[PDB]
Structures are given as structure tokens and as C-alpha cells.
Symmetry: C3
Subunit: 100 residues, 3 copies
């Protein structure tokens, strides 16, 4: 298992591409995005990205970048969970997630 | 980053409003809900509520579980999270990137 | 609260049943699956979340899925610490106690 940070960005759907770009630009290996509702009849549609980042700082870079660009104007929460990636060709490389 | 508990409630879709009410009542600053399938495939919903404290999360969990989980399928679990950003979650205070 | 591993498998939608079977076969008490998009532009995939009582059950599932599918199918499997607060099936009549 390879430590990861699960960066979660829940924010407005309309930022999807904007945030995907940020995620792509961060060098995060990918991301998972889903449609969600959230409150912060009063549920609003939003999207949740989950970006497993190799490092915390990458996650924060993404968070910071998203937040600074968008979170004044757009609803969003970014949080981060410890994860370990057990498998993820892209995330762990040909190396595998048990790089001995 | 502000420590949080990601309270996850996966339960029957029909409880959405009912649980949202509980969440709203808990003083949780918001929640994220999504449609999911599950076996425990039935359509259900997953709430994710980031709570400032563990006890809030448990209050919600306890409240939901007591009010619904003896009659409705549902799992509640809780993950450590840190909120990096979340106006509503961290307040005007911010999520205090330095602790 | 009962410690759990939230095994998350994000992979191609078409593996849903195949992975569900693996999950079911692992003796995981259940799983949550959702439709997701992902990049690794967005492709539709599924995220399973399996709360497993033990890490090794999660890894068993992960290993089984990854071995059986991840050479041919896109997917990431990762695992989070979780605690189950409630989950009849997950914690048994015993309750989530701890
Ligand atoms: N071990 C688990 N891992 C991940 N998700 C779970 C787990 N157990 C339950 N869930 C989620 O919570 C839902 C409710 O599960 P529960 O065991 O309480 O009821 P169930 O009647 O078995 O549900 P189902 O209708 O899915 O069979 C499940 O469908 C699933 O979405
Ligand atoms: N405490 C929380 N737990 C989980 N998700 C949250 C929480 N607070 C906010 N969210 C998610 O982030 C989204 C935006 O939240 P926020 O910026 O507070 O603005 P708003 O009040 O305009 O929805 C919500 O719709 C929800 O999906
Ligand atoms: N760093 C990551 N963070 C979050 N999810 C990821 C990450 N990398 C991959 N995924 C998820 O796994 C899926 C497939 O992974 P991958 O093996 O990279 O295939 P692909 O590159 O063909 O999409 C992605 O579409 C995405 O949902």
C-alpha cells in the first residue's frame, strides 16, 4: 500500500472542468468525480472530486488552487483523508503499490 | 486544515429528507449526499457530513441510527478528515492552514 | 465504533457485477457502489466502498479485484480507516460497541 491523500473537493458542478484542469495541472495522476447533492429542497447539485495524491502537498496545492480560484465565488468544501492505494497502475506506476 | 470527522451515512434513499433534517438539526454545517447502490444492489444514499467534532458526528449517527436503522438499512461510519476549505465548515475563521 | 477499512475500488462500470461478486465472496458484509466519473476527460466508472472488518479482507478484495481485472481494466483501489458507528450487518447483533 502506497500512502495517499484522498483530496475531496465538493463544489459546484460548473467548476468541474476548471477543477479537473487544476487537478490535471497538479500532476495528480487522476481523479474521480461524482455528482452529489449537498447543503452548506435545499440540497444543491454539486460534484465531489476525489483525488488521490501521492503527497499531502500536492493535495493541498490542488485544494489551495481550487479554493483560491473558486471558493470565494462558488460553494465548495475541500477536505483530505488519509488513504492508502492498494492498486492503481497510474497512481503507483509500473512500480506497484508495494515498491520494495 | 481543520480536523473533521467525515460521518458517512449510507442508508435508504427514502430517508434522505429525514436524515438531512437530522443533519441540519445537529448543527452540522452541511452535508453531501449522493445516490449509491449497495448490498448490506439497492439504491440508497450516502451522506457525508463533515463534523467539527466526533461527538457531533456520533450525535448524528446515533440519532439517525436510533431513529431509522432498526427499520431501514443503513450503515454509518466515520472517517478522519481534515477540511482544508469550507467556509461554512470552518467559519469566517478559515480552516487555519497552520493548525 | 468498530474499526473498519473503507476499501474503495474505483474501476470500470462493466466490472460492477464482477467486483460485487468478489466483494460478496470476500465475506465483506456489504458494499456501496456509486457511479463516478474519473480521469486517470472523464470516463464513467464505479466506486465501490466496502467497509471491511479487517484490513486483510479489504486487501483480499483489492488483490482479488486487481489481479482479476486491473491489468485489463482501469481501476484504483485504496483504503481508508473508518469506524463503523452503526451497521447491523457490519457489526452484527453485537452492535458497534468499542
Ligand atoms: N460492509 C459494508 N461496506 C460498504 N457499504 C456497506 C456495508 N454494509 C452496508 N453498506 C451500505 O449500507 C447499505 C445498508 O446496508 P445494511 O447492511 O444496513 O442493510 P441491507 O438490508 O443488507 O442493505 P441492502 O439493501 O443493500 O442489501 C448497503 O446497501 C450499503 O450501501
Ligand atoms: N459539513 C459538511 N459536510 C459535508 N459536506 C459539506 C459540508 N459543508 C458543505 N458541504 C458540501 O459542500 C457544498 C458547498 O458547501 P458550502 O461552501 O458550505 O456552500 P453552500 O451553503 O452554498 O452549499 C455543499 O453542498 C455540500 O455538498
Ligand atoms: N489519483 C487518483 N485519484 C482519484 N481517483 C483516481 C486517481 N487515479 C485514478 N483514479 C480513478 O481510477 C480510474 C481509473 O484509473 P486508471 O488505472 O488511472 O485508468 P485511466 O487512466 O484509464 O482512467 C479513474 O478514471 C479514476 O476514477
Amino acid at each position: 500500500a502506497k500512502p495517499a491523500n484522498k483530496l475531496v473537493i465538493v463544489t459546484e458542478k460548473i467548476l468541474l472542468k476548471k477543477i479537473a484542469k487544476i487537478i490535471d495541472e497538479s500532476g495528480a495522476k487522476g481523479y474521480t468525480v461524482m455528482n452529489t447533492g449537498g447543503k452548506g429542497s435545499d440540497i444543491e447539485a454539486n460534484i465531489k472530486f476525489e483525488i488521490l495524491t501521492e503527497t499531502r502537498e500536492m493535495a493541498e496545492e490542488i485544494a489551495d488552487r481550487v479554493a483560491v480560484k473558486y471558493f470565494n465565488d462558488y460553494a465548495g468544501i475541500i477536505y483530505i483523508c488519509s488513504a492508502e492505494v492498494l492498486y492503481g497502475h497510474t497512481f503507483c506506476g509500473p512500480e506497484g503499490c508495494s515498491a520494495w
